[PDB]
């Protein structure tokens, strides 16, 4: 009748701009995992995440991972603008061989790992105004060392703390020192957080240890872009409506195929 009960099992690359993350998740692309750096500054109507994607950098968690994912996914871009943070008194550009960028050590491209310089680590107090007419998205993190000895060797202070403020948000994080299961060789962890700065607002960062610093901001847009988890191959054909199962005809008013859809689709109808 006029419930669409079949899909093709493939995802058409037209008319929508489809971006395949073969081996990369959107968050991993956002952070700049070295095997994901081909995605720098990429845009998309629909980002397609595969179940064969893997992280190959510093082990990390994102509190509210789903929300960061969906907001980047709906913005439709990874436009990153590098900004001139001044990190006085610390060593910048820390890397780890659990995240190689070729021969030597590496880190996420969009993050700046700060450690002591000499044997002091000062209280960083940095500001970054937003004088533009758009929303700035800042990604940053905090390092959770395995042991008290590792905490003191990297950041001097026995206990660190990160505080990021706007006038519309406040994020104060203290590291959680402790041993985690070996992941790609590491017992330590990084936690990732994010901060939106509206025009005329100013980003404030204060830290006496464990700060993983931002390098700049991602240009926030307001889009009809989105993201989808699917293993359907991408074919060069035409379809206005896409599901994780593949493309579907959109002439019939309804569809049994999947509640998740992108494009001008018939309505899901519970069979």
């Amino acid at each position, epitope marked *: 009748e006029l419930v669409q009960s079949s899909s093709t099992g493939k995802i058409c690359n037209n008319p929508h701009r489809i971006l395949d993350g073969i081996d990369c998740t959107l968050i991993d692309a956002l952070l700049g995992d070295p095997h994901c750096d081909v995605f720098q500054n990429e845009t998309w109507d629909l980002f397609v995440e595969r179940s064969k994607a893997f992280s190959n950098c510093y082990p990390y*968690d994102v509190p509210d991972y789903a929300s960061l994912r969906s907001l980047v996914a709906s913005s439709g871009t990874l436009e990153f603008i590098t900004e001139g943070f001044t990190w006085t008194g610390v060593t910048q550009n820390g890397g780890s*061989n*659990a995240c*190689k960028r070729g*021969p030597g*050590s590496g880190f996420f491209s969009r993050l700046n790992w700060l450690t002591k310089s000499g044997s002091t680590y000062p209280v960083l107090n940095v500001t970054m105004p937003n004088n533009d007419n758009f929303d700035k998205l800042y990604i940053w993190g905090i390092h959770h060392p395995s042991t008290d000895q590792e905490q003191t060797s990297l950041y001097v202070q026995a206990s660190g703390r990160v505080t990021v403020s706007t006038r519309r948000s406040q994020q104060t994080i203290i590291p*959680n020192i*402790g*041993s*985690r*299961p*070996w*992941v*790609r*060789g590491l*017992s330590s*962890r990084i936690s990732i957080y994010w901060t939106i700065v509206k025009p005329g607002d100013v980003l404030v960062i204060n830290s006496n240890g464990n700060l993983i610093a931002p390098r700049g901001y991602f240009k926030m847009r307001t889009g009809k872009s989105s993201i989808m988890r699917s293993d359907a191959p991408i074919d060069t054909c035409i379809s206005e409506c896409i599901t994780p199962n593949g493309s579907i005809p959109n002439d019939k008013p309804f569809q049994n195929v999947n509640k998740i859809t992108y494009g001008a689709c018939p309505k899901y109808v519970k069979q």
Partner: antibody
Amino acid sequence: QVQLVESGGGVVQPGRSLRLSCVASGFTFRDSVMHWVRQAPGKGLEWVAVTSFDGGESYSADSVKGRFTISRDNSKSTLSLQMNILRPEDTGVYYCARDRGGLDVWGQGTTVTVSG
Amino acid sequence: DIVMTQSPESLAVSLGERATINCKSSQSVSFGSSDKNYLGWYQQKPGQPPKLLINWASTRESGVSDRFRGTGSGTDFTLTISSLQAEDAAVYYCHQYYTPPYSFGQGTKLEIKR
């Protein structure tokens, strides 16, 4: 002395559940990653699950994902394995083991027989 | 997911000769191009829990005899028992703890040749 003692094994019907427990002694239990490994009769070692110092991160093998849950109780120095929807192929001796990179301390194990 | 493959599955060695068990991992279990290798060797005799013999591919555990040696770095690993004694008869296992899911080799039965 440094010791782990497992408990809770038994004969259980398929599809049922039972909870294994391991009590640690003679070391700072709360500071150690802890594992469950098992071994079916006449078969090789099979890694089951692992959990961080605080129970905040765990991992389990794909043969048990969705069915077995690992947790600890640092105030009782107690590792746990909650086993749901048991199947005959889950039969084996289950060990709790401390991580020192390579698993340097093991209990004597507790035996689970899943059968009708 | 990293898979461990041991070799041979079964081995017979005369008393006082050397034994050699081989272990291969499907992906590297080394930290960088470092010498840190997340690889353990175990010995298990009937009715007993395994015993960690070698840690970090080469480091002999406390109380383990001189005769046991391990090496390798990356994917290929070797365990040696140099002047075989009757107490050595047992199953040996390798084990990767680089990244989860962790996993054991399938086991190698070392028996006394007569």
